[PDB]
Write an enzyme that holds these catalytic residues in place. Sequence first.
Site, short mmCIF file in Angstrom:
data_model
loop_
_atom_site.label_atom_id
_atom_site.label_comp_id
_atom_site.label_asym_id
_atom_site.label_seq_id
_atom_site.Cartn_x
_atom_site.Cartn_y
_atom_site.Cartn_z
N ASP A 192 51.37 36.03 39.30
CA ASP A 192 51.30 37.37 39.88
C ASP A 192 52.36 38.32 39.34
O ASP A 192 52.11 39.51 39.22
CB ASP A 192 51.33 37.31 41.41
CG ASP A 192 49.97 36.92 42.03
OD1 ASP A 192 48.95 36.76 41.30
OD2 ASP A 192 49.91 36.77 43.27
N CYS A 224 41.89 41.65 29.79
CA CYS A 224 42.65 41.41 31.01
C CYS A 224 42.45 42.49 32.05
O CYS A 224 41.37 42.70 32.50
CB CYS A 224 44.15 41.21 30.77
SG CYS A 224 45.03 42.19 29.68
N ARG A 230 48.41 40.95 28.26
CA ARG A 230 47.97 39.56 28.17
C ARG A 230 47.02 39.36 26.99
O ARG A 230 47.19 38.45 26.18
CB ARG A 230 47.31 39.10 29.47
CG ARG A 230 48.19 39.21 30.70
CD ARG A 230 47.57 38.54 31.90
NE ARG A 230 47.95 39.22 33.13
CZ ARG A 230 47.76 38.73 34.36
NH1 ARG A 230 47.19 37.56 34.54
NH2 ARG A 230 48.13 39.43 35.41
N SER A 231 46.03 40.24 26.90
CA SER A 231 45.13 40.27 25.77
C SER A 231 45.90 40.20 24.46
O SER A 231 45.50 39.49 23.54
CB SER A 231 44.30 41.55 25.82
OG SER A 231 43.58 41.65 27.03
N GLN A 268 52.38 44.00 25.46
CA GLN A 268 52.91 45.08 26.32
C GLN A 268 54.40 45.03 26.63
O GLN A 268 55.10 46.03 26.44
CB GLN A 268 52.10 45.22 27.62
CG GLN A 268 52.16 46.61 28.27
CD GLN A 268 51.48 46.66 29.63
OE1 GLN A 268 51.51 45.70 30.39
NE2 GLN A 268 50.88 47.80 29.95
#
Length: 287
Positions: A192, A224, A230-231, A268
């Site tokens: 999370d 994502c 994440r991608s 990111q």
Amino acid sequence: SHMASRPILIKNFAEHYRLMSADSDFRFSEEFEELKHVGRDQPCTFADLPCNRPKNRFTNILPYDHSRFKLQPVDDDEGSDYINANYVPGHNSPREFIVTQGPLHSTRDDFWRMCWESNSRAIVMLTRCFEKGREKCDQYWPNDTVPVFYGDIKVQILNDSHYADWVMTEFMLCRGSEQRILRHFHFTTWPDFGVPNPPQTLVRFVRAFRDRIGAEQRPIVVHCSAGVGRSGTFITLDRILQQINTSDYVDIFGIVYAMRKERVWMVQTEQQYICIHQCLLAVLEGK
């Protein structure tokens, strides 16, 4: 080279890591900071039209014009060609991945049409639908075996395989009298907050994916929440692990800089930038 490539000689990757992580990731944090502008200058004209405004999950994550995937135009719809997604390079092809945002209910039709038009045989989903209370991505696939029509595409679950951290799902895809199968890789463990800990879980998934997908020649859909962090961490990790089998060099920096130029904030956060290094570090050191 030097400007958009910092290659490391694998035999030294473990030292380079130490050297990079040392002093509260001084060098690491600093190396990342160089990418913070890459490709941001590029126009996003279409994504930014009124008719396409509601299609974007986030107002500041929009596909650059030169890279965006385009849907077959629809003759009454103005801006019907649009979806938030870019071709992003991979280990085997410049147009190897299509990374997109997690569809809204408002865009899952479009999202399916992309898979069909792109001829993509594999979706990689790196987020949960809900997390900590927010909605990240709309459930765009059936949750039982009753076939479901998304637009003109009829998606049905042929079977699924649950594991510790991800669920494989095999969809049949039908448009007209035309049929294909598609493999859906849903990594369901990402914490999370922060990156996966221990990162081994992500490596485990990437291995499972690549082993399963093979030397694919059509696009792979990757997504994502926003289609960036994440991608970006997955694609990069997938690339480098394929890479350490044909070279004694790795270019994580080079990989990211190339991805940035193709779609926004690709890896990111510098936590993810570091995480990629840890995963490989883990592999090179036999877990």
